[PDB]
Amino acid sequence: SVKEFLAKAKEDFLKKWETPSQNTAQLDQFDRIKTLGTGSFGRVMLVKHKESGNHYAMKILDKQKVVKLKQIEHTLNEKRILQAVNFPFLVKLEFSFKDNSNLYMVMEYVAGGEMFSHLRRIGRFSEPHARFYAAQIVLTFEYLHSLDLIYRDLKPENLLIDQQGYIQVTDFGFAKRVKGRTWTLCGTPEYLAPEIILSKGYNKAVDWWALGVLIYEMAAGYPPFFADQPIQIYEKIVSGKVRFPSHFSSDLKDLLRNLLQVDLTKRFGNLKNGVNDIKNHKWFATTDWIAIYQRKVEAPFIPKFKGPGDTSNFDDYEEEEIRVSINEKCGKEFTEF
Amino acid sequence: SVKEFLAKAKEDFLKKWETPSQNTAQLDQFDRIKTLGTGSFGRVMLVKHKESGNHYAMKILDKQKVVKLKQIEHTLNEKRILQAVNFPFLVKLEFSFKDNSNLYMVMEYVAGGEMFSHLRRIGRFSEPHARFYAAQIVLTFEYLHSLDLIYRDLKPENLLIDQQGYIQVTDFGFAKRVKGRTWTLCGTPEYLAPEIILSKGYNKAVDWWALGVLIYEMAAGYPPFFADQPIQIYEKIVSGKVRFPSHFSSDLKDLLRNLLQVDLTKRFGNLKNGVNDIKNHKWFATTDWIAIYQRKVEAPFIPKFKGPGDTSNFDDYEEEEIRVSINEKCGKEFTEF
Amino acid sequence: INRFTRRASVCAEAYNPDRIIHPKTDDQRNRLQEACKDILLFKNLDPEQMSQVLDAMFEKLVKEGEHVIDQGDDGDNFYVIDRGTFDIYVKCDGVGRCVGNYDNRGSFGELALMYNTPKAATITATSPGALWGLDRVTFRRIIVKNNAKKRKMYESFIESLPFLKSLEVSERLKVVDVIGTKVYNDGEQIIAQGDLADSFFIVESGEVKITMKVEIARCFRGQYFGELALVTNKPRAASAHAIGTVKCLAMDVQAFERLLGPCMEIMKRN
Amino acid sequence: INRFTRRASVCAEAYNPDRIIHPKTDDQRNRLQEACKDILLFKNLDPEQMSQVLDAMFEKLVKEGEHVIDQGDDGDNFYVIDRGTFDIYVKCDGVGRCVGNYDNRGSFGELALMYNTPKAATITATSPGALWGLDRVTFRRIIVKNNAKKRKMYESFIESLPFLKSLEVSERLKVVDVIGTKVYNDGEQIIAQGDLADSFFIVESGEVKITMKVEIARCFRGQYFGELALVTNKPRAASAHAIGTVKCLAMDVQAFERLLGPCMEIMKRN
């Protein structure tokens, strides 16, 4: 049934993947309300649909800046993947469009905030709490991977908590369709798999490594590999030597030694039984996988939200205008967008 | 002979202390060359005597800023003490004067730089190297204390290395003549004695505590009490619990337990035999005290200096003008200066 | 990492030691005391200094949404929460984020009681609330005035002592610095006959009764006992007992000799 | 702490793998190699990647007082000192200070070989000197091009193997990811008759001689041996020895089954 479900998601994905959406809205249809996030690449803007009054989180990318960084395909991957996928734990793309200066992607607004904020405020999550979130990622990776999609940017910063306390995975900037092996060094330093660091070429297994870093960070309150200098973090990652906190359960530790495995002949997710080695693992004994997928389980944490368009679960950033030049920029580079 | 020497320094000090120097130069006689140091209070300026071509380190204090901080007497203490003392390891005051905005104190220029710079670059000093410097402080404190002067700001930042690799102690901002007990909370967090932190009232013993912090910092490369939050540093200081590095010699450790003594009935410097408990201590067995005083011993380190007025042993600061208002400020507050 | 950053000098306002009562319920006062007991600056205070400090803490009411303090806004004040909820918020580069919150309890700004310390956070009331505040200048004065008073004189206790009459001024101050204090309840044995003579005692308040294997002495404010410990290390000749609640100064004789040498030496001068 | 600072994403320039030789003395090349041996990015490189990397490092001459690099000035370059003295200087608030120095040796900027990294220090020559430089784009390409080449094909070694002919593409790539390499000198025993059959071998270069308790096989480039380990866990029937200097691919059979299941299973499909 997981087979027959996945055989079907695949059918649906391939149909949308073949013919993509283009210019399904325009900037003047939205009111800008507030900056929700910035990062190494563009930002995110709470916006209000002038007519419907609906709120959305609009991602904005400056074409010139993408071009300078040589991020062009990453931007085309992100858009093309987002319009074709469909899963309960993936933030949905509603509209996309471009203008003279920018690319725009309008997603559903998730008002609960980043897991990073909550994790840092509480300190760490209890194992059943961390387990609830991990189960959603496990199922999301299973879904993405069955389509030959890799995600490549797992981290608390990128997981949004919805009104039910379920996870919405958000930023697909590094996501890519890989049938063979790929080579771009990207991600987030703490979360990079050894094979990315050392340019060995790599596919699905890097996400499962990152899942191990995530779980470890949820249960402990800090990631397994850390240091003064980034080069030092990489050295630890590549040694793959990891210390567990005295409060980690034995089953948790057993799972994390199988995920944080430098040797690919031993990494969970990459072996003969695939993702089932993780689902059937004991830290997950008490997980009802169908129930999680149906969002029938009860969230360990519900965000406090007042009215729609409330932004109290998000940090406050310097507000900068969306500048739209009278000259069209890099029009050819982004013709497919 | 130490008695007959000290009985005489005292005679000389009291004579100058009774009638102080005033306005022995003026600003237009000097060329400003470069900022040598800034801190919680005024700064220091390399200057060139227009006529003699001699270089000096001129300390500058803004009257309004001193007044706002309630630092007025500290400034009068510093000037009045500096013009009356005389010892080989104390930087000499050459001239002092004021104008509409500033107080000025012109010291001899010591070109070797702060011990802080050298200590941080090398990491730490070998025990014989640290011992050379400690011996100079010990003798300087003996001299200052016999005049009822306390120094209150011992730290590597405040010790200058001269052309022979001997120490020149410099900033007398917190120095004060105390016949009884005093109460101002001042110094540098890492170097504060318990009794200053807890406002118990205190005299000479705080300098000997600080000597222990200094020695420990020279031999180890970092101070004995450190932490994230200052309040945390104070907690450690007041517990007075100290960990020694495995490389510390047993004699060094024995000395530092006697100096870093929270209990005043046990602190070296404060007991029946006074400073002799430190001089006769064994870490100092190989110290020739008269020879150190006569600068006949051979320095473990000579600074590299090119021509006179060279500033390569000092850091580089934002250069700000010396502003002199057309309106005289706080003229009465500083009438004695 | 940053080992090349200099350690800056710090300095509070001058105060030379040589009235404020903000009323509060008994319960408010107990909770306030309990909140301050593990804070470095309060924890060693004697009962009388603590009491004056609590006396001096002022009421601050806040309305929901009010800023109790602002980041970078001078630290001359320490605050303890009496009631209410609060959010803690810091702006860093950059970015403003809620870093935590208080629920009807908590305290902040203790470093301000030592020297000027701009606050590292903005704290906002998320309900009507109240706090106890304390200045640095007010706190300092209480502490310094009180200690200067317990000295100068604590001695004059010390200088009324026959064995110690030849102490010089500086030597007497060395003893004032360290002399300890002990409290006893009615009928506690302060000194036991036949025991090691470790120290001498001065009665600060109350009444001590000296007895011997027989009442031979009654000791009131300013009187010493156990003083033979200074000149002989024989066992105690007498027992001593508190009459009522007694507070004594207590000086260990070993510590005394570390500072000053043998007492008889001081007594054979001029 | 500063636990509330987000971890930023990083990303190098795209390069899809599907010439530069800067001459240097033998000694310069040895010292350069020795300087890079413990650096993370170099230390695992095979001899051929290392050699191309060293080939590609360019000469940078500096005059006394010249800035080799400037603080905040883009990190696309890694540098190793060939000769000369240098001062290291950082400006922090604030304040510019000399934080250290190099004496005819040292290296800096390795993080730049991963992604853009503005330098944290200004480095100044205090004598005439020289350095070896390396771009990030140049380095990446060498590494990626070479690995893509060692794959696609490494297999085609793998796919010429009778037992493995029914492997699907993705399964073959899983084997390519992990297959190890071993080097032998003339006359070393690669496999001993009677020993545990732990793995199979493919000759990459050189010549291997198979003998049995008697020469029964000679193995050249692209040929496998020890392959019975995949279908039976009996002791080795034959010994194997290197003729000349031999390089073999080596695959452990346990690791193989962890990835793929028993080989016979793959061989009983269609």
Curated annotation (Swiss-Prot), chains A, B:
Specify one Pfam family.
Pkinase
Regulation of catalytic or functional activity: Allosterically activated by various compounds, including ATP. Activated by cAMP; the nucleotide acts as a dynamic and allosteric activator by coupling the two lobes of apo PKA, enhancing the enzyme dynamics synchronously and priming it for catalysis.
User: Changing W183R: reported impact?
Assistant: Does not affect interaction with SMO
Name of the molecule in the record: cAMP-dependent protein kinase catalytic subunit alpha
PANTHER family per record = CAMP-DEPENDENT PROTEIN KINASE CATALYTIC SUBUNIT ALPHA (PTHR24353:SF82), CYCLIC NUCLEOTIDE-DEPENDENT PROTEIN KINASE (PTHR24353)
Where do the catalytic residues lie? D153
Relate the assembly described in the record. A number of inactive tetrameric holoenzymes are produced by the combination of homo- or heterodimers of the different regulatory subunits associated with two catalytic subunits. Protein kinase A holoenzyme is comprised of two catalytic (C) and two regulatory (R) subunits which keep the enzyme in an inhibited state before activation by cyclic-AMP. cAMP causes the dissociation of the inactive holoenzyme into a dimer of regulatory subunits bound to four cAMP and two free monomeric catalytic subunits. The cAMP-dependent protein kinase catalytic subunit binds PJA2.
Q: Which organism is it from?
A: Mus musculus (Mouse)
Top-rank lineage group of the source organism: Eukaryota
- Where does this polypeptide localize? Cytoplasm; Cell membrane; Nucleus; Mitochondrion
Q: What is its main location?
A: cytoplasm
Q: What is the effect of changing K59H?
A: Reduced interaction with SMO
Which positions bear Phosphoserine?
S126, S325
Recite the UniProt keywords alphabetically: ATP-binding, cAMP, Cell membrane, Cell projection, Cilium, Cytoplasm, Cytoplasmic vesicle, Flagellum, Kinase, Lipoprotein, Membrane, Mitochondrion, Myristate, Nucleotide-binding, Nucleus, Phosphoprotein, Serine/threonine-protein kinase, Transferase
Gene this chain is encoded by: Prkaca
- Locate the Protein kinase domain: which residues? 30-284
Q: Does the keyword Manganese apply?
A: no
Post-translation: what modifications? Autophosphorylated; phosphorylation is enhanced by vitamin K(2). Phosphorylated on threonine and serine residues. Phosphorylation on Thr-184 is required for full activity. Phosphorylated at Tyr-317 by activated receptor tyrosine kinases EGFR and PDGFR; this increases catalytic efficiency.
Listed InterPro entries: AGC-kinase_C, Kinase-like_dom_sf, Prot_kinase_dom, Protein_kinase_ATP_BS, Ser/Thr_kinase_AS, STKc_PKA
Family, according to the entry, reads as follows:
Belongs to the protein kinase superfamily. AGC Ser/Thr protein kinase family. cAMP subfamily.
Transmembrane as UniProt keyword: no
Task: Please state every residue range assigned to the domain named AGC-kinase C-terminal.
Answer: 285-337
The root-end lineage is: Eukaryota, Metazoa, Chordata, Craniata, Vertebrata
According to its UniProt record, which reaction does this protein catalyse? L-seryl-[protein] + ATP = O-phospho-L-seryl-[protein] + ADP + H(+); L-threonyl-[protein] + ATP = O-phospho-L-threonyl-[protein] + ADP + H(+)
Q: What class of enzyme is it?
A: transferase
Swiss-Prot record, chains C, D:
| Entry's Gene Ontology molecular function annotations | cAMP binding; cAMP-dependent protein kinase inhibitor activity; cAMP-dependent protein kinase regulator activity; protein domain specific binding; protein kinase A catalytic subunit binding; protein kinase binding; ubiquitin protein ligase binding
Query: Looking at the keywords, is Hydrolase present?
Result: no
Subcellular location(s) of the protein = Cytoplasm; Cell membrane
**PTM annotation, UniProt:** Phosphorylated by the activated catalytic chain.
Q: How does it assemble?
A: The inactive form of the enzyme is composed of two regulatory chains and two catalytic chains. Activation by cAMP produces two active catalytic monomers and a regulatory dimer that binds four cAMP molecules. Interacts with PRKACA and PRKACB. Interacts with the phosphorylated form of PJA2. Forms a complex composed of PRKAR2B, GSK3B and GSKIP through GSKIP interaction; facilitates PKA-induced phosphorylation and regulates GSK3B activity.
Q: Which residues carry this modification: Phosphoserine?
A: S9
Q: Which residues of the full protein are shown?
A: 104 to 393 of 416
Q: Where does 3',5'-cyclic AMP 1 bind?
A: 41-162
Question: Family assignment?
Answer: Belongs to the cAMP-dependent kinase regulatory chain family.
- What's a single GO BP term from this record? fatty acid metabolic process
UniProt KW Transmembrane helix keyword: no
Q: From which organism does this entry originate?
A: Mus musculus (Mouse)
Q: What does this protein do?
A: Regulatory subunit of the cAMP-dependent protein kinases involved in cAMP signaling in cells. Type II regulatory chains mediate membrane association by binding to anchoring proteins, including the MAP2 kinase.
* Principal subcellular localization: cytoplasm
CC terms in the record's Gene Ontology section: cAMP-dependent protein kinase complex; centrosome; ciliary base; cytoplasm; dendritic shaft; dendritic spine; glutamatergic synapse; neuronal cell body
- Record's protein name: cAMP-dependent protein kinase type II-beta regulatory subunit
What are the UniProt keywords, alphabetically?
cAMP, cAMP-binding, Cell membrane, Cytoplasm, Membrane, Nucleotide-binding, Phosphoprotein, Repeat
Tissue pattern of expression reads: Four types of regulatory chains are found: I-alpha, I-beta, II-alpha, and II-beta. Their expression varies among tissues and is in some cases constitutive and in others inducible.
Q: Any idea which positions bind 3',5'-cyclic AMP 2?
A: 163-270
